[PDB]
Nucleic acid binder design. Structure first.
Lengths: 228, 219, 219, 228, 228, 219
DNA sequence: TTGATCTGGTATAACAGGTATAAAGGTATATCGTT
DNA sequence: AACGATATACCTTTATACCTGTTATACCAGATCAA
């Protein structure tokens, strides 16, 4: 450890991991694979090989580096996706106990209402083409299977991408994944009429956005979320 | 892929299914490894990940246990997230903007189902909120209590958790606080809350949203 | 040429010769490379090709295994092929025309060797086929069951595979289905199947082929 | 990746390959070598050189580009030949187990009967010259070795080319290759008389086609396939 | 070229290739990739990049180096296989004109008779186990297809490997390849009885070798080559 | 793999099929490349390989032609092969041993079909062979003429080519020749050839093979 | 003598192979607990 | 006090990524031939 300090009983792995943390915080490395390999650091610190592996693995969990296969660690910063990855541990309890299912629906409804209100209020002359091509590519009836579902979720994503906030897209993807993960026994009984109703509601929504009237858009969105 | 994450999620869902309660009820990890056809460092990495999460307790050579409280992981995630500040100077305001997208989803709900049982509660809350006198201690406590009783109107435990999380996040983020400017800030805040509760009584969510937007713009 | 394809076909024929069963029975790929005088990226490309095909399983650092089921490559090829639609508008009908070249090779075979043991089977099949009532669920199932029991007359496993492949291909190709027109469609279909089985009993393959051509032209 | 996302443990090669797939599907490239070289894309994505090589190689297998030697990738569409190339993996089992040999023969017989019926029914006044010159160039007895075999397979090919379906010629070539690949110990014992019988049967077939009588043609074809 | 000599009209590629030849003959390099890459030599000689590529390519043809993929040239010596590779250009004429087919058969017969005579005369007490295990693994009747053919050619190879001459194995492999390349329409009509006759003849050959009587072995080999 | 070798073998088989005779009958290589979907350096490498082989002739900017004589490639291969001498000191004797495996396949053939028409030819050959007097000039010429008339007994053009190739190879390999020892060498050679022709007349291939082995062992 | 075409050489780009590094899994050893 | 089980650490193997080298293709320049 370049300082002659064993620290065996007090877990010497903490010493090397905090030394690596300090060396990274000292702005002595770049943003990629500037850090050496495992054997180089092992020989430089006169320690074991599995210790450095555990250190890096713990560091990745803490959200500091990233490794894939046959490449050194790439130092980065913990973004919004890292927080969502570290979370979701208690999400199973919410779907386990009877409640919470309506709470997630209410949260999603509030989020979508807020974002559609912001989009209708800050409606520029360029984002109209995005929603136009979205409703155009989601207008034809060619595949009544899962293609319409992915088209609808892509339309929702491009609608949520209007503000331009990295945390917004992250939480949107997280909520959509947590919602589609709790859809058991999906059957194709009345999904075609559901697709037609969704198309009509999207047409009404874009018409209300063009006319600058969030009331009708909010009513159509509430009706769509109540019809499920 | 990586075996580690597989057995990690397996033991996570096992401890979530309430298969083992308090104490050292887990079997020997050697025969677990022999049955799962995994490696020794994988189990050590899984235990280290669980220790970093804050669910098990390993000191010397004893076995792991369960952890019912969840306050350690909260401050852990707080310290881990409150770091991305020097990268984006104004992007933090985006996070503040997120708070907007939350509060605007609250003042427009009082006119939905609140009839009289919540009106008395918010009135008796704002009574003490206005009776408060201290600028740094009483006014901040009154403001957070008003925000809590506002978030508790729909009756949702997730909303309260999100609100307190945003509160502690902004508290850890903002490093400098004022006293003279905060006085007029909370003054205008409760002056606008008066109009907010007036519009709530009159069943007009537009005026409440406008007052909230003006309060957020006043900073 | 490319060394990769050579060792790929070599390991393919080796795993087809049943040299190694289930599990990690393959030796170390390092000495394999040393004996074959090949390169490191070639082995990685071969393993990636085998993973894309759906015969091996590599997640992290373990060894490859064998894969007995073949349902993943089926849907993989389905998704990979069901794409050339916007290039040729009517050329897809050519594929449908191919189906003709298959069905015309079936109705002309019942008069070859089927005497009575298949007649009872097709009769008890068409019984339930006509007893079906639902337009979108029962009629389509009855039609595919009749097509299956027709293709199973010569007793050929390849014919059944080709038939089910054409079925799933046309299902993935056609994006819009009807209910009112499909009713009369299957009505005329079984009305022509009546004449088809009559001609089969009378040992006349010409009338069956004419009825099949008329059914295909009716769309 | 122009988005600051490591994705090391989750195989970053999938990220770049799906990015390339999306860029190709966005109709931002032509149909040839419009895509840049390996070093250009490597420097643009700030990734490794072997990663882009593996991506392109995987893409070629999926059936999207094509490379030869010293030339950029040519984007195209997976035709019928690509499906046959991706298949044929289970064809060895059929020739391994005792059955299947008669099944392939029955399939080929059904295909040839259907195509000859279509040719006799849609017989125009122009395709007659093709079969005429075919039987003329396959009439003289100059080389009794493998020249007659290739003449016969060329006659079969030009007969199968009458409908004009790209998938038809593809499956015909595939079946002929899979059939000639399973002809062990080909000896020249009675191949001359076989050539004479084949010539007489082709004469009978073209006569039945001229007379518009598929029955005699089908009988002659059945006799030829039974005589082998 | 380190000497200030253009030699443009007289093909300067000859100058650099003869300089490389002299540098190699000066015993200044080892036996592997000791020579630098293409860019290093290009910058050292102040010439073009394709010129060095053509030089190395010509050198490989001359039989001096060897390249595969992503590796420097490995200097070696032209062995017997290089001569066979450079030859075989006029072998197509022999199979084109009617003669020569019996000439190759006579040459192969002379070669096999000479090698079997040498093996029977220099029969030691160790090579008997090789032929014993060969005839043992070629005795069972498990696959009457091409497995017996490859077993027979492996037996012929291990029989030709008795003297221990690198040129002998090279010319043996060359002759066997040139002979199997001229086997058109191989059919499985009487190959099983041919396999039984070959097994009996190999038994007679090994018995004559044990008894030290090359006459019976030569007669059996002549009968086998006449039966084809 | 390498495109170069493909088009090289293609043009080789094309010029072997006698598609183009003498002169510049080949078309423009630009449209050849456009039709073959190859590169420019590949055609240059193929032309360089053909020039090194000795089939085409390119000096400045003209087109390639055909080459009927094959004497240049002979000496080219001779110079290219006569180099591996310092590696294996005694392995060159293996090559000499190969010559054995050739000559032993000749003396045992005279008793097969030669009746009298070849006996007179070999007799009138050995007449002048013995009439020769010079040690370095006449005896070597007599020996090579006797070897030629021996190899020409079965009537095979390939055998003569192989014999002359071995002759020029051994001539280029052996750098030192003697005169006094070569005298007794050829003396014993023809003294053994006397017994060889005697055994050929008596129809006894064993004695001829023994005499040939003794001559080869005498060196 | 000038212009055009063809051939050859050089340079650049792309693909493939090999090597190195990192991560995961398995095995062994040590420590703690229970009988 | 001894034995067994569990946990942690270390080592080895496999996979992935990056870099380097080689080959092929394209472009430019020079030379030769024809008008």
């Amino acid at each position: 450890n370049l300082r002659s300090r064993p620290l065996a009983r007090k877990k010497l792995s903490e010493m090397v991991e905090e030394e690596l943390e300090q060396m990274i915080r000292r702005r002595e490395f770049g943003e990629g694979e500037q850090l050496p390999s495992e054997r180089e650091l092992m020989a430089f610190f006169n320690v074991g090989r599995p210790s450095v592996r555990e250190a890096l693995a713990a560091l990745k969990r803490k959200g500091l580096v990233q490794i894939n296969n046959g490449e050194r660690a790439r130092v980065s910063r913990p973004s919004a996706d890292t927080i969502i990855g570290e979370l979701s541990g208690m999400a199973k309890d919410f779907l386990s106990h009877p409640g919470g299912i309506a709470h997630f629906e209410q949260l999603r409804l509030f989020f979508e209402s807020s974002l559609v209100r912001y989009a209708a209020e800050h409606a520029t002359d360029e984002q109209i083409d995005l929603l136009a091509k979205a409703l155009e590519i989601n207008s034809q009836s060619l595949d009544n299977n899962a293609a319409f579902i992915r088209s609808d979720v892509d339309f929702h994503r491009v609608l949520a991408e209007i503000p331009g906030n990295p945390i917004f897209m992250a939480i949107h993807v997280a909520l959509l994944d947590w919602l589609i993960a709790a859809r058991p026994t999906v059957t194709d009984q009345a999904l075609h009429e559901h697709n037609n109703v969704s198309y009509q509601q999207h047409i009404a929504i874009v018409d209300a956005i063009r006319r600058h009237d969030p009331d009708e858009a909010d009513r159509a969105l509430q009706s769509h979320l109540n019809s499920v």
